[PDB]
Specification:
Oligomer: monomer
Order of helices and strands: HEEEEEEH
Number of helices: 2
Helix content: 10-25%
Structural class: alpha+beta
Strand order of the largest sheet: 1-2-3-6
Amino acid sequence: GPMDRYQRKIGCFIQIPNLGRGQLKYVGPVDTKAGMFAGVDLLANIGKNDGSFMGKKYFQTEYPQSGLFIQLQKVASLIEKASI
């Protein structure tokens, strides 16, 4: 409430439209950005980051560009369907 239901699914896998399978690793705000975000590990270098942003660690990624922040509203129903 509001983030609790999504936070409980950290570690789940979700299938992101036009991106692929990603592991949910973080849910919350990102410094200097608007809104809430899911931080996902795409398990290939098709993301943007290594789980850090502006010098702060948000989550751990397998590869140097496998992490990605996605606006939470875009994946909120995928997360809700996923099982932990």
